[PDB]
Write a protein that binds this ligand. Structure first.
Ligand SMILES: CC(C)CCC[C@@H](C)CCC[C@@H](C)CCC[C@@H](C)CCOC[C@@H](CO)OCC[C@H](C)CCC[C@H](C)CCC[C@H](C)CCCC(C)C
Ligand SMILES: CC(C)CCC[C@@H](C)CCC[C@@H](C)CCC[C@@H](C)CCOC[C@@H](CO)OCC[C@H](C)CCC[C@H](C)CCC[C@H](C)CCCC(C)C
Ligand SMILES: CC(C)CCC[C@@H](C)CCC[C@@H](C)CCC[C@@H](C)CCOC[C@@H](CO)OCC[C@H](C)CCC[C@H](C)CCC[C@H](C)CCCC(C)C
Ligand SMILES: CC(C)CCC[C@@H](C)CCC[C@@H](C)CCC[C@@H](C)CCOC[C@@H](CO)OCC[C@H](C)CCC[C@H](C)CCC[C@H](C)CCCC(C)C
Ligand SMILES: CC(C)CCC[C@@H](C)CCC[C@@H](C)CCC[C@@H](C)CCOC[C@@H](CO)OCC[C@H](C)CCC[C@H](C)CCC[C@H](C)CCCC(C)C
Ligand SMILES: CC(C)CCC[C@@H](C)CCC[C@@H](C)CCC[C@@H](C)CCOC[C@@H](CO)OCC[C@H](C)CCC[C@H](C)CCC[C@H](C)CCCC(C)C
Ligand SMILES: *C/C=C(C)/C=C/C=C(C)/C=C/C1=C(C)CCCC1(C)C
Ligand SMILES: *C/C=C(C)/C=C/C=C(C)/C=C/C1=C(C)CCCC1(C)C
Ligand SMILES: *C/C=C(C)/C=C/C=C(C)/C=C/C1=C(C)CCCC1(C)C
Ligand SMILES: CCCCCCCCCCCCCCC
Ligand SMILES: CCCCCCCCCCCCCC
Ligand SMILES: CCCCCCCCCCCCCC
Ligand SMILES: CCCCCCCCCCCCCC
Ligand SMILES: CCCCCCCCCCCCC
Ligand SMILES: CCCCCCCCCCCCC
Ligand SMILES: CCCCCCCCCCCCC
Ligand SMILES: CCCCCCCCCCC
Ligand SMILES: CCCCCCCCCCC
Ligand SMILES: CCCCCCCCCCC
Ligand SMILES: CCCCCCCCCCC
Ligand SMILES: CCCCCCCCCCC
Ligand SMILES: CCCCCCCCCCC
Ligand SMILES: CCCCCCCCCC
Ligand SMILES: CCCCCCCCCC
Ligand SMILES: CCCCCCCCCC
Ligand SMILES: CCCCCCCCC
Ligand SMILES: CCCCCCCCC
Ligand SMILES: CCCCCCCCC
Ligand SMILES: CCCCCCCC
Ligand SMILES: CCCCCCCC
Ligand SMILES: CCCCCCCC
Ligand SMILES: CCCCCCCC
Ligand SMILES: CCCCCCCC
Ligand SMILES: CCCCCCCC
Ligand SMILES: CCCCCCCC
Ligand SMILES: CCCCCCCC
Ligand SMILES: CCCCCCCC
Ligand SMILES: CCCCCCC
Lengths: 231, 231, 231
């Protein structure tokens, strides 16, 4: 385990997702409101899944070697298994907040699936130049998601409760900034151009992941917006 | 096929899931009620999926060799492919019975996914001691599911029709007893401590599977609880 | 890339799915109706997914070699990854058109999953004779889907708006004819009996895919049936 310099960030990531999971689980114990239960369910599942996949990376299961550039390159494939489930869940949190129509939810989740799936293919592609073709397609899918979060959702929120509008706005901004960093880290890290070494890359992803999941969740679950308006 | 002593239980399992599938399909032919159609759909799909995966194990496709303990260990991975889809379907049957809120359904299905996914990782893990780490996490996810089935669902059922309350109670009890045996069999069988040989392990899983799927389905689909109250 | 004679059909397929995707995306820009948004979302996702998987086949990622018949046989596994997601989406388009009950939708999607999953197992099976066992099970699942599209849906459509009835009828007929060709092509092509060479097989699948996705989508998205009745 300790033979990989990035182990420390995997261990920290595992611990923080674990602690985040336990905290949200305990916090959601005293919740009977059906709307709030949905948000607690979605939001607690996110670090729970991330916990399992961080642990899989820490123990070495979620790592494979991919030959490109005439080298055996360590690729943590478990990230994509995580993101495949957790990024649509995060989008669902946002979509449910603003009472998105079903068509838009399907568009988001579908685009997200394409984003992660093509990122995975890019990560495992042995022809070096083609890795960036997949990166570009995945990034286009991300750009679509970001467009919808801004020019389909933000104007929907203004027509809703002020607490849901303000909470959505914060979470939207957090999401757009944090999510946009991922293709950059991939591009310059071990999966892409290889300018940033894997240990630093792992640190960067860990900071992004904890912020995008536990940070996000802390903001969401402390908000009154997740409760139905009741007396 | 006959070169594996466990083939007989795989063959029997295949036949019983097949027959179970055909029986539920025929039985559901004369059903127009929209609620009953949901239960027939869910409940017929369960042995249909199990049929395909038993057949895959029988024909040898759903088997791989995993090196641990300095041995090549036969691991039937197809079980997890089965359970990944059939256990949430079984939980959906229960959840729909008691008209569970969406948040609770998501919690159940999500926990179930974690249960099966981590069981799969445990099954394929090459570091012997780590297999039991995954077993423990999976078992914790199972315990969460069982907690919800008792302390989130049972009190919901009492507020519903007597036929749905009584049927849920029976199916809940069947589910908790049968499902709890699976981590025990895994732990002592070829995936875990290796005390019980694979042929007996396969027998045990076959008895559990047929009971948890066809047995469960027979109880559910004979009940009046799957029909909306109509005149 | 050009080393495989079928590359031309993969390239054409990629281009046509890409163009189809862009066309539906642009066309759906000026849509606010919640019902129409659902259909645009579903129908645009279908060629988008197919685009990615055609590209994966073109670049060689979505190809593996399967030993059977004492030969190394090129099997494009990416087709199943495509179909796993796009065929239920296509069925959802049809089901939503006729306002299918949830039980029937689950039956369709479930049968479809079995159809594609067993086709995949058949495609990767190393025992030649067993490949056709999987083909038969998959074809039985297809026959179930076709039965439901005719003897569960058609009589539902007649009870609905004339525009939805007529559009459903056309799309149903297109779907039944086109989908039925797939098991035939598989059976006689490289996955099955090997009578038709892979380059021609790839052409046939490309024509079917573009017709079943872009052709289908063009018919659906030009129809008034995807809009709620409004003044
Ligand atoms: C009802 O709706 C609210 C429940 O959602 C909240 C329910 C949660 C989504 C349930 C999912 C968590 C499962 C209990 C997972 C079990 C293992 C966890 C990964 C625990 C790991 C953290 C610990 C080991 C440090
Ligand atoms: C609505 C939305 C959800 C839509 C989703 C968008 C989605 C279509 C985007 C593309 C997803 C697709 C790329 C997933 C591919 C998974 C693949 C990387 C798994 C690894 O297999 C790749 C090679 C080794 O590199 O296997 C060696 C060859 C082996 C023989 C491989 C054979 C097994 C195949 C992998 C079977 C395909 C199953 C499905 C791809 C499962 C989906 C997995 C998940 C990652 C989407
Ligand atoms: C409408 O809602 C009720 C239909 O659900 C019931 C519909 C069923 C869920 C449909 C799923 C069954 C498919 C027909 C699968 C086809 C192959 C089966 C595995 C048949 C195998 C048994 C036989 C070969 C012994
Ligand atoms: C809401 C709920 C549904 C949440 C679900 C909870 C879920 C997160 C729990 C964990 C699921 C995750 C462990 C699934 C892992 C699948 C993996 C075992 C497949 C086999 O690949 C493992 C190694 C060989 O041992 O592959 C050799 C290396 C290869 C290069 C592997 C690369 C391909 C990757 C497998 C791509 C990942 C795709 C997804 C994991 C598909 C999910 C499969 C299913 C089993 C969940
Ligand atoms: C809101 O509901 C309507 C939007 O659905 C329509 C939304 C679409 C379903 C969104 C899915 C498309 C994504 C934008 C995918 C991005 C990459 C595409 C594959 C583009 C490829 C075509 C081009 C490169 C030739
Ligand atoms: C409600 C509906 C959706 C129901 C769906 C119906 C469905 C049950 C029908 C059967 C699906 C099932 C056959 C999928 C099998 C995927 C499998 C082909 C992936 C490739 O792995 C096969 C072998 C190499 O040939 O791997 C070499 C051995 C490796 C060690 C394999 C270990 C990893 C396993 C693949 C883990 C299983 C994960 C799930 C099968 C993911 C589903 C993938 C998708 C194709 C259904
Ligand atoms: C909790 C984890 C999160 C929120 C991860 C989000 C990941 C992304 C937004 C990844 C995007 C990528 C691209 C846009 C292209 C390059 C490859 C990816 C997958 C890193
Ligand atoms: C129809 C099949 C059923 C109902 C199978 C259920 C399986 C489980 C409840 C399995 C649980 C496991 C654990 C709790 C940890 C050990 C590994 C598993 C996957 C066997
Ligand atoms: C857009 C792609 C479409 C509509 C593909 C549809 C594919 C099928 C209907 C495939 C059916 C098969 C069988 C019925 C058995 C043989 C194997 C398959 C998977 C080709
Ligand atoms: C979106 C964040 C991308 C910026 C990443 C900056 C990382 C700087 C770390 C120094 C690079 C290490 C190179 C020498 C080993
Ligand atoms: C490929 C995995 C996609 C599924 C991710 C799980 C989250 C799905 C959320 C469903 C949103 C509801 C749409 C109507
Ligand atoms: C990883 C596979 C999970 C999907 C299993 C299929 C059953 C899902 C049931 C969905 C329940 C509805 C939730 C609102
Ligand atoms: C194995 C992949 C199955 C999921 C395919 C995605 C489409 C699912 C459509 C869901 C229909 C809604 C059912 C209530
Ligand atoms: C085009 C949609 C406008 C809002 C999205 C902001 C785009 C941020 C660019 C991210 C950079 C990724 C490499
Ligand atoms: C803690 C929830 C109470 C109901 C669940 C019963 C737990 C049964 C233990 C199963 C043993 C698994 C090894
Ligand atoms: C049995 C359902 C009647 C409508 C389905 C038509 C069946 C077409 C046969 C397709 C041939 C596949 C090999
Ligand atoms: C070896 C790198 C070759 C450059 C490939 C860049 C492709 C990026 C695609 C963006 C449209
Ligand atoms: C393929 C990238 C798409 C980003 C621009 C958005 C196009 C308009 C979409 C309107 C729903
Ligand atoms: C070789 C066996 C070593 C014991 C591992 C047991 C781990 C179980 C984890 C329960 C918390
Ligand atoms: C991680 C195992 C959880 C089992 C105990 C239940 C904790 C309380 C959950 C309340 C929804
Ligand atoms: C080598 C071919 C052997 C014939 C197998 C055909 C099986 C088809 C199953 C249809 C019930
Ligand atoms: C297993 C093939 C099934 C095709 C015939 C349909 C049987 C009746 C189903 C009624 C819903
Ligand atoms: C509750 C604390 C969870 C921490 C477990 C994972 C940390 C890795 C330690 C090596
Ligand atoms: C309808 C009977 C189904 C039995 C087929 C599978 C049994 C295995 C026989 C070797
Ligand atoms: C918009 C045009 C998309 C075409 C890209 C794929 C075609 C393959 C060219 C070799
Ligand atoms: C992106 C950083 C999130 C900060 C989380 C703090 C939560 C305090 C309520
Ligand atoms: C767990 C055993 C189930 C027994 C099924 C019998 C069904 C008869 C109605
Ligand atoms: C199966 C062929 C479909 C033809 C599509 C033409 C669409 C024109 C409206
Ligand atoms: C990590 C355990 C949380 C302790 C309770 C915090 C207040 C809800
Ligand atoms: C007005 C909301 C600002 C949130 C920005 C957070 C950036 C990490
Ligand atoms: C809208 C601001 C996005 C900032 C992107 C930063 C990526 C590191
Ligand atoms: C396995 C075939 C079932 C025969 C009909 C049973 C009575 C519905
Ligand atoms: C009161 C219901 C009892 C059911 C127990 C079944 C145990 C297998
Ligand atoms: C509530 C009783 C559970 C019994 C567990 C038996 C496991 C073999
Ligand atoms: C492929 C681009 C489509 C151009 C607009 C067509 C009319 C909606
Ligand atoms: C009456 C609808 C006829 C459609 C047939 C299309 C065959 C490809
Ligand atoms: C209902 C007519 C089906 C035609 C099947 C054609 C397959 C090539
Ligand atoms: C909570 C489980 C953590 C396992 C870490 C083992 C190194």
């Amino acid at each position: 385990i300790t033979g990989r310099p990035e182990w420390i960030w995997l261990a920290l990531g595992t611990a923080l997702m674990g602690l985040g999971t336990l905290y949200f689980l305990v916090k959601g114990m005293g919740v009977s409101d059906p709307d709030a239960k949905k948000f607690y369910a979605i939001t607690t599942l996110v670090p729970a899944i991330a916990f399992t996949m961080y642990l899989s990376m820490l123990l070495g299961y979620g790592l494979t070697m991919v030959p490109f550039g005439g080298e055996q390159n360590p690729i943590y494939w478990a990230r994509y298994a995580d993101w495949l489930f957790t990024t649509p869940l995060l989008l669902l949190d946002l979509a449910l907040l603003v009472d998105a129509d079903q068509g838009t939810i399907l568009a988001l989740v579908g685009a997200d699936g394409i984003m992660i799936g093509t990122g995975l293919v890019g990560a495992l592609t042995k022809v070096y130049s083609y890795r960036f073709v997949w990166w570009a397609i995945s990034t286009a899918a991300m750009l679509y998601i970001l467009y919808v979060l801004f020019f389909g959702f933000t104007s929907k929120a203004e027509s809703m409760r002020p607490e849901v509008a303000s909470t959505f706005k914060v979470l939207r901004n957090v999401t757009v900034v944090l999510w946009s960093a991922y293709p950059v880290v991939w591009l310059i890290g071990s999966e892409g151009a290889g300018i940033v070494p894997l240990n630093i890359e792992t640190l960067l992803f860990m900071v992004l992941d904890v912020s995008a999941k536990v940070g996000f969740g802390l903001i969401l679950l402390r908000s009154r917006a997740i409760f139905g308006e009741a007396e």
